[PDB]
Amino acid sequence: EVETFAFQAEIAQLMSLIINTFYSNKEIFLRELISNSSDALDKIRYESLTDPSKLDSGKELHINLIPNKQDRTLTIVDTGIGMTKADLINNLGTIAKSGTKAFMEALQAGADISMIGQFGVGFYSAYLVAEKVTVITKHNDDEQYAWESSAGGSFTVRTDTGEPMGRGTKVILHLKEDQTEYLEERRIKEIVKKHSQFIGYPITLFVEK
Ligand SMILES: Cc1cn(-c2cc3c(c(C4CCCC4)c2)C(=O)NCC3)c2c1C(=O)CC(C)(C)C2
């Protein structure tokens, strides 16, 4: 049921760099993950123009931010295109291999961690604030999967037995003890306004009861 895979050498190096470098501007993780969600939403919206049946799994195109102080988790939910088993294991990793190499060469040449998005590897900025990242995803062409990594050179992929999503992605960030500010309502609002104010989809903050 659970398959373990090694990250491509370049990816493992980037992950180690993101976790061990002293960089206080950690807030950029939220705009990077919102940008991945925005790209997934663009993809399904565009594909639905030629094939409207691609929206049978859900017409709503949105982003939900769900902080949870008790579990110390920040969940980002999108109703985008989602990811297939091949996207999670092979496809996005192949694209990330070339981008990571270019970003690490740029960091050595003077560039800062905030430029991560230009190299298409912005997803990995999640490790600036999270000790573990869980990706629950559902694409129209495949089953629902759970991708997970606490870094250390490996990741796991399994078929998701939990609640069916219809279509899209859930990014669950198991936050580091010193990064609980990203669970506060006013802090999330400030990050969204500063970095993601022009995203072409509704971004809804789920306020804790
Ligand atoms: C590069 C890269 C990009 N993303 C990534 C992450 C997400 C999404 C996307 C979409 C798919 C189509 C357009 C962009 C990509 C998405 O749909 N929603 C938010 C999370 C990943 C990588 C990896 O290397 C590891 C990973 C676990 C496969 C996640």
Q: Give the chain's largest Cα–Cα span.
A: 47
- Ligand 1 atom with the shortest distance to the CA of 33: 19
Q: Is 119 in the pocket of ligand 1 (CB under 6 A)?
A: no
Q: DSSP label at 123?
A: G
DSSP annotation string for 49-97:
TT-GGGGTT-----EEEEEETTTTEEEEEE-S----HHIIIIIHHHHHH
* Residues contacting 101, CB < 8 A, separation 6+: 10
Q: Which residues, at least 6 apart from 23, have a Cβ–Cβ distance to it below 8 Å?
A: 112, 113, 128
- The annotation places the binding site for ATP at 36, 78, 97, 123
**Using what technique was this structure determined?**
X-ray
Distance between CA atoms of residues 115 and 96, nearest Å: 15
- Tokens for 166? 């219809």
Domain span at residue 189 reads: 1-209
- Phi and psi torsions of 110, nearest 5°: 115, -20
Name residue 46's amino acid. Y
135 close to ligand 1 (CB < 6 Angstrom): yes
Resolution in Å, one decimal, please: 1.9
Which residues contribute to the annotated binding site?
36, 78, 97, 123
Query: Given the CA of residue 120, which atom of ligand 1 is nearest to it?
Result: 1
CATH of the domain at 142: 3.30.565.10
Give the single-character DSSP code of 7: P
CB 84 within 8 A of CB 139: yes
Cβ-Cβ contacts under 8 Å for 176 (sequence gap 6 or more): 129, 130, 131
Per-residue burial over 127-147, b = 16 or more CB atoms within 10 Å of its CB, e = otherwise: bbbbebbbbbbbbbebebbbb
Helix (H, G, I), strand (E, B) or coil at 37: helix
Ligand 1 centroid, distance to 156 Cα (angstroms): 15
Half-sphere exposure of 200 (CA within 13 A, CB side): 8
How far is the C-alpha of 178 from the C-alpha of 208, rounded, in Å? 20
How many domains are there within the chain?
1
Asked if residue 39 has its Cβ within 6 Å of ligand 1, the reply is: yes
Classified as helix, coil or strand, 162 is coil
Answer yes or no: are the C-beta atoms of 72 and 115 closer than 8 Å. Answer: no
